[PDB]
Amino acid sequence: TTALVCDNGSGLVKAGFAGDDAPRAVFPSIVGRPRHQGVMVGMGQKDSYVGDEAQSKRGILTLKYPIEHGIITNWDDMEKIWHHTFYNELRVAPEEHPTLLTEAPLNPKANREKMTQIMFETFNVPAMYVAIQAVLSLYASGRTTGIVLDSGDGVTHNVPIYEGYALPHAIMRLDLAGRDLTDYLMKILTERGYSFVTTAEREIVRDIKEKLCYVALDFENEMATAASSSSLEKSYELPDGQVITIGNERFRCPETLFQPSFIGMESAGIHETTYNSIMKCDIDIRKDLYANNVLSGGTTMYPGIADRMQKEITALAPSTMKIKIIPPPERKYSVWIGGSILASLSTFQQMWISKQEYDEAGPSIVHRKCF
Amino acid sequence: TTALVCDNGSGLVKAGFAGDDAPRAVFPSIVGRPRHQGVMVGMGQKDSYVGDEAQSKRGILTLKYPIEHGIITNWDDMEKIWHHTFYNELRVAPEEHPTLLTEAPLNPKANREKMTQIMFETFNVPAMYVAIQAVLSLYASGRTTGIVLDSGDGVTHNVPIYEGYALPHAIMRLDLAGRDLTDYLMKILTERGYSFVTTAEREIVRDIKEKLCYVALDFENEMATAASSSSLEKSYELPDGQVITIGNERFRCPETLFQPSFIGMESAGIHETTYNSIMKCDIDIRKDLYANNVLSGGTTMYPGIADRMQKEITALAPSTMKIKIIPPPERKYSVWIGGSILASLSTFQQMWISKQEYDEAGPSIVHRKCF
Amino acid sequence: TTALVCDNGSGLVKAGFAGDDAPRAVFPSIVGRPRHQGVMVGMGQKDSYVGDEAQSKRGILTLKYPIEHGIITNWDDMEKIWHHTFYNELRVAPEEHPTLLTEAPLNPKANREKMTQIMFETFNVPAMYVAIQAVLSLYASGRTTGIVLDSGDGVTHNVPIYEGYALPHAIMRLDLAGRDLTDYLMKILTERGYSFVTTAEREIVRDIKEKLCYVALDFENEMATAASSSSLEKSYELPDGQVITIGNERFRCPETLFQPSFIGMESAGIHETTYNSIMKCDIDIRKDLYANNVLSGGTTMYPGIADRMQKEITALAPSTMKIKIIPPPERKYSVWIGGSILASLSTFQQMWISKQEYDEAGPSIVHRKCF
Amino acid sequence: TTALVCDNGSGLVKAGFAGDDAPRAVFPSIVGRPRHQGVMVGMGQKDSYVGDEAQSKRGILTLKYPIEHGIITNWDDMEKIWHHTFYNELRVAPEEHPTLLTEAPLNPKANREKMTQIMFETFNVPAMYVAIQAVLSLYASGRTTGIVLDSGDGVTHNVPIYEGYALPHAIMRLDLAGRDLTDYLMKILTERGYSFVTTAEREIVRDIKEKLCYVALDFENEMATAASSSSLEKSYELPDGQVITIGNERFRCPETLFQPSFIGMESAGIHETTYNSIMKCDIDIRKDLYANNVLSGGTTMYPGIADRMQKEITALAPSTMKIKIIPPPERKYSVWIGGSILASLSTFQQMWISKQEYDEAGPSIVHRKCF
Ligand SMILES: Nc1ncnc2c1ncn2[C@@H]1O[C@H](COP(=O)(O)OP(=O)(O)O)[C@@H](O)[C@H]1O
Ligand SMILES: Nc1ncnc2c1ncn2[C@@H]1O[C@H](COP(=O)(O)OP(=O)(O)O)[C@@H](O)[C@H]1O
Ligand SMILES: Nc1ncnc2c1ncn2[C@@H]1O[C@H](COP(=O)(O)OP(=O)(O)O)[C@@H](O)[C@H]1O
Ligand SMILES: Nc1ncnc2c1ncn2[C@@H]1O[C@H](COP(=O)(O)OP(=O)(O)O)[C@@H](O)[C@H]1O
Ligand SMILES: [Mg+2]
Ligand SMILES: [Mg+2]
Numbered sequence A, B, C, D: 001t002t003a004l005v006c007d008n009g010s011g012l013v014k015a016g017f018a019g020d021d022a023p024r025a026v027f028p029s030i031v032g033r034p035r036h037q038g039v040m041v042g043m044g045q046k047d048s049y050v051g052d053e054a055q056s057k058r059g060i061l062t063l064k065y066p067i068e069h070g071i072i073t074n075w076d077d078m079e080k081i082w083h084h085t086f087y088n089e090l091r092v093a094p095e096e097h098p099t100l101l102t103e104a105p106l107n108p109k110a111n112r113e114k115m116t117q118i119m120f121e122t123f124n125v126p127a128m129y130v131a132i133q134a135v136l137s138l139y140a141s142g143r144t145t146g147i148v149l150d151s152g153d154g155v156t157h158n159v160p161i162y163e164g165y166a167l168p169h170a171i172m173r174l175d176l177a178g179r180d181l182t183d184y185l186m187k188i189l190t191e192r193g194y195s196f197v198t199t200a201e202r203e204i205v206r207d208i209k210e211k212l213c214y215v216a217l218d219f220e221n222e223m224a225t226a227a228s229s230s231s232l233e234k235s236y237e238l239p240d241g242q243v244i245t246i247g248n249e250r251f252r253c254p255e256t257l258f259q260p261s262f263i264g265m266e267s268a269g270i271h272e273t274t275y276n277s278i279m280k281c282d283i284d285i286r287k288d289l290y291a292n293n294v295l296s297g298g299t300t301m302y303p304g305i306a307d308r309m310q311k312e313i314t315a316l317a318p319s320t321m322k323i324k325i326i327p328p329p330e331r332k333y334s335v336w337i338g339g340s341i342l343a344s345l346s347t348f349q350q351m352w353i354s355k356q357e358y359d360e361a362g363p364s365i366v367h368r369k370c371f
C-alpha cells in the first residue's frame, strides 16, 4: 500500500512516506526564470529552476511563489513543483501510491476540484484524500480535546475540538502571517539606512527574521531599556560583508501579531481571537478547552511567545480557572506527523476516493467524502 | 569548413586558422608612404609599404595608423591591410573560408555595418561573425565566472560575467591605453636631454617602454630610493650608437594607469574602475566575482602589476573575503585562443551569417544576430 | 514673523519668503574645486565655487553633488550651500527667521537629527519645521483628496490621501529618477559616435535631455516610423560648434520610466506602482482616488506623459469608472507654493519647534512633533 | 630692493631695471676669437671680443654662439657674457641686486641647476628666480585668458592659459626658428650666383632677411605674378658695393614656417600646431581661446602674418565662432615688459629663492619653487 503524504503549505514543501518519524524532503516552493543576456554557447542551461537550485542561483534569476495565502494562483508552476517532488526528490512512481494532501479551512470550492482533477488525470493516482491541517495537528500530540492555533506562512486559523467533535461555527481565520511579518521588517529596516528591494534580498530579510527576532514579555519597559542601554544589539554579516547592527527593531517585528494595527488591519490579536473562539463554544466545555491549548506551526517558535500568550489569556479569563499552553519541542512538523499517523490506521482504509468513484461521479465527489 | 580567425586590434594583427595553438601571422598594422624625391631609375620601387616592410624601411617613409582607439578612420588602408593578410601572408583564398572578427564594446553602429559590407562584397566570404574580445578572453581559461579586465593598445574595458550571463549595465570603458603611455614616456624623456619627435622614433620609444619599464609596489619610497641611490639605472643602445641612461623614469610611465591625472584625465584608476564594476552587480554574486579576477592584454605584462592590483583591491574591499588575480603565463594571445576555441564547437555552426540572409535583409542584419 | 521656506531637493535649490507667488532664488546645488596648475599671482582667486559661479567656470574645476537620492553625504558642503543661500543670495540674517524644510519619505532617522542640530547650533534659528514634499504638493492645488506622484531628480514616491487622512502603509518609493535618465542618455549616445565622459559634459547631456526628449504614445510603431522616415531628427549646437544629430534616441530615454528594465531594475513602471498603491487602500475610496490623480515634479514635464499615463491606467482599471490626470501648468514649483501656503495659516503657528524645547529635550524631539 | 631683469634669449640679450618701460641694454650674444697671425707690437689688443665689438671687428675674427636652441653649450662663454652685461654695460654690482631669468619649456633639468649654481656662487646674488617666457608674455598685455605663440630665434612654443590656470599637457614645442630661416635663405640665394659661406657673412644674410622678406597671403598666384612680372624686385648694397637683386626669394623664405617640409621636417605648420593645441583643451573653453590669440617674439614681425594666420585658422575652425589675432605694436620686448611688471608686485616678494634656503637644501631647491 505504502501511502504517500504531501504537505504543500506556503513557502515550504514537506514530503515523505507514511509510518516514518520525519519528512524525507524539505525544500522551498519557488520557481525562477532567467533575467539577463545569456551570452556564450555549450552551457546547456535550463530555462527554469525549481527548489534549492533557484536558491543557489538566486543572484541572476527572479523568484516567484505559486501558492499565496491559501489559494493556488499558478497551476503550471504547481504542476512543476509536484513533478519535481515526485520524480526528482522522492524518486517514486505515483502510479501505485495513494497520496494525502492538506488544505486550510474556508477556501474556494474550485481549489479542491482542480487539485483532484490534476492528480487523477495528469498523475493517475489510484486514490487520494484531503484533510484539514489543524485536525491533523491534534493527532501528533495523541490528544482528543483542545483548541489548536496553527500559524504558518500564509494564514493562521483556529478551531476547537471537544472529545472528537468539531464546532464549525467557532472557526476563525486571519490573513496575518509571517510573509507580512517579513515585509514589515523590511519596511522598518529602512529607517536605519539599509535598503532591500530586490526579490532575492527578501531571503536575506527572512533569514534575519528567523535568527534575531524575539517576543518581549512587556513592550513599554522593554522599549525603555532599548531606548537607554545598548545591550540589546546583535551583528549580522551579509554575504558580501558590510556587517550591520540591529537595535530595537529586534523585538518590534514579532509584536505585530499581538497588535495588528501596525500594518493597518482592524482585526484583534491572536489572544483575543482565541478568547472569542473559546467564548463561542458551550458553557460547560470551556473549562476543558482552557487547559488544553496547543501551539503548532513555524511562526510560533519565537522565544517567549508561550509566556506572553499565557499572560494575556489569564489577563482576560476569570481568575478561578487554570490556563496552560502546550508548546511541544517540535512545532514545524506536527502537521506532517499527524498525517503520517492518520494514514496508517486500519480503520482509515475505507475512506479513500477510488478512481471508479471519480469516473462515475466526476470532480464533485470531493465535497461528499471530505472535511 | 576550416574557419578563419582574425584579430584586428590596434597596432598588431594576429591571424591564423581555427583549431591551432598560436597565431600563424603577427605583424604591425602600419601603412607607409615615401617622403623624399626619388632619384635614379630601374629600381621598380612600390608606392606604399604595409607590414614589416615599412618597419624595415622606416627611415625614409612616414608611418600612419588606420585604426585608432576603436573606430576605423582609413578604410582604404584597412582594405590594404586585409588584402595583405589574406593574399601575402596567409596565402589563402577567402572565397571558401568563413571568418571571425573581434570588436570592442560601446562602438559606433556604422563600424559593424561597414565591416560587413566590405567583407561580403569586396572579398565575397560565404559567412562571417563578430564577437566581443573580453567574452572570448574567458573561453581561453576554460572558466564560466569572473570579471575580465582587457587592456590593449587602443582602449581598456571591463565586463562581469556570472555563470554564462552577462551584465550589460556594469560595463566600463576607458580610453587610457599604451599609446598614451608611450606618448607620456616620450614627453618625460625630454627632461634628461633626449628628443624624439619623428614618427619613426616612436618605435624607439615604444621598444624602450617594452624592455625597461616596470610597476613599483609603493611609489613614495621607491621614488626615495631612486632619488638617493643609483642602483635603478639601465643602459640602452640606439641604432646608431650614443647609449643613453634611464633613471626614475623607468617606473614612472606605467604608474599613469593607477593615477590617470598625470595626463589630465579626470577618471579613476583601473583598480577603482574594477571596484565600481564589482559593486554595480548583485549583492550575492560579488563573493564569486572577487576570487575570479582575470587579466588579459598586452599592456598588462608589466612586472608587479598583479601584486599592486591585489594590494589596492584588498585595500578597498572588506577584510572578510578573499581576493585573487589570475595572471596566466600567456596574456598576449588569450583573445585569439578563445576565438579559436569558439570557432570549433559543433553548436556554434548555426549562428553564422549566411550570404542569403545578407542579400535578403541588408547590412542591418548584424545588430540582430550579434553581441 | 516672516517665516522662511527652503527646498533643498537634489540638484536644484529654491528659496524665498512665505506669502509670495514664486521662489526668489533658484540655482544648482553644486560645489567645485580647482583642478589645474594655477600659475600667475595677484588674481586673488577662491579655493571653492558654489552655485552659478561653478557653472560659469566649469571648464577648469570638478563638479560634486552633496545631496544624492535622499540622504546627505557631504555635511561640510551642505553647510557651504546653506551659508551661500542665507548670506549671499537671500541677504538675510537667520537669527530672527523661522525656516521650513522638506524631506522625502522613508529616510534614515539620523538625517533629521543632524539637520536639526546644524540649524539650531550653527545658525541659531528661533524655530524650524520639517514636512513631507508630497503632502505640501496637495496644498498648492487647493484640494483634499487625491493620489500624488512626485518625481524629481533623486527619488520618485507615491502617497494617497483621502479627506485629510494619510495611509502610511500604501506609500511606495522608487529610486529611478532623472539622474539615471541622464546617465542612460549618455550611455546610448555613444552608439552614434559622441563621447561624454567628463563631469562638466554631464551638463551638456542634461541640457539635451531637457530640450529634445519626449514621450511617445506607442513605442512599436513610433520606432517603426523613426526606423523608416527621417522626420524625427533635430540638431543641437555644442558650445564650440560641431553640431550633432539625434534620431530615435529622442524618445527612447524617457521611456525607461515605464520600462525600468532598460537599466536592470526589477521593479515595475510608475503606472503599475500607482495602480498597486490604489489597490492597497480601502474598497470604497478607490472611486474618489481614481479621478483625482495629481502630477508634480520636474521630471514629469515630458510632452505626452499625461496621455500615456491615462492610456495605461485605463488599460488596467475596470471600464466602469472614470480616470483623469491633473497636469497643472506649473509643476516645478508646486512644492514651494504649498510650503508657502502652509507657512502662513494662523493655525500652524503652534507647531513650531522652539529652542526652549530643543534645549530641554535634545535632538530626539523631532520624531515627536514631525510627519 | 631694485630687482634686476635679464632675458638671455638666443642671439639677443636684453637687460634693465624693474619698473621701467624699455630695456636699457640690447646687444648680440656673440663671442669672437682672433684668427690671423698678429704682427706689430704695442697695440695692446685683447684675446676675445664680446658684444658689439665683435660685430664691429667681425672681418678678422670668428663668431661663436654659446646658446643654441635652448640648452647652453659653452658655460665659459656664458660667464663671459654675464660678466659683460653686469660690469661693462649696466655698471652695477650684483652683490645687492636680485635677478630674474627666463627659460623655455621642456628643457633639461641640469640647465636650471647649473644656472643657479653659477649665479649663487660666482656672482653671489642675494636672491634669484626663473620664469617661463610665454607666461610673462601675457602680463604685458594685461590679460588673463588666451593662447600665446612665442616664436624667437631658438625655438617656438605654444601654451594655453584660461583665467590664470595653465594646461601643462597642451604645450607644444617646435625647433623650427629664425636661425633655420636664415640658413634656408642662404641656401636658396646660391641659385642666383651669390655665395655666403663665411660666418661673418651670416650677418649679411640675416640683415637681408630682416629688411626684405615678407609673407604672402596666397602662394600660387603670388609665385605666378613674380614669375611673369618684375615688379617684386628690390636692390641691396653690400658693404663693399656690388649691389644685388632679389626676386621671388623675397617671399619664399618666411613661407617655410607654414610649410616646414622645405627643410625636411615632418611636423605641421604653426597654424596646425596651434589648432591641435586648441583642440587638446576642454570643450567649453575653446570659445574663449579662439578669440584671444596673442602673437609675440621677434620672428613674428613679418608683414601679413596676422592675415595669413587668420585665413588658415578660420579655414580649419567651424564657421559659427569668431577668430581674431592680437598683434600688438611692440612684439620684440613683450617678454621683458611682462618680466618688469611681474618683478614689481607686492605679492611676488615672498617667492624669492633666498641664499639661506640654497645653503640648506642645495641646487635641487629650484624644481620645488619654480614653474
Ligand atoms: N526558527 C524559526 N523562527 C521563526 N520563524 C520560523 C522558524 N522556522 C521557520 N519559520 C517561519 O515559518 C515559515 C514556514 O512555515 P511552515 O511550517 O512551512 O508552514 P506551511 O507548511 O504552511 O508553509 C517560514 O516562512 C519561516 O519564516
Ligand atoms: N612585453 C611587453 N611589455 C609591455 N608592453 C607590451 C609587451 N608586449 C606588448 N606590449 C604592448 O601591447 C600592445 C599590443 O597589444 P595587443 O595585445 O596587440 O592589443 P590589440 O590586439 O588590441 O592590438 C603594444 O602596443 C605594446 O606596446
Ligand atoms: N522642462 C523640463 N523637461 C524635462 N526635465 C526637466 C525640465 N525642467 C527640469 N527638469 C528636470 O527636473 C530636475 C529638477 O527637479 P526639481 O523639481 O528641482 O526636484 P528637487 O527639488 O527634488 O531637486 C532636473 O534634474 C531636470 O533634469
Ligand atoms: N623686424 C624684424 N623682422 C624680421 N625678423 C626680425 C626683426 N627683428 C628681429 N628679428 C629676428 O628676431 C630674432 C630675435 O629674437 P628675440 O626676440 O631676441 O628672441 P630671444 O630673446 O629668444 O633671442 C633675430 O634672430 C632676428 O632674426
Ligand atoms: Mg503549515
Ligand atoms: Mg587586444
Ligand SMILES: [Mg+2]
Pocket (backbone or CB within 6 Å): C009, C133, C151, C152, C153, C297, C298, C335
Ligand atoms: Mg522636488
Ligand SMILES: [Mg+2]
Pocket (backbone or CB within 6 Å): D009, D133, D151, D152, D153, D297, D298, D335
Ligand atoms: Mg625671446
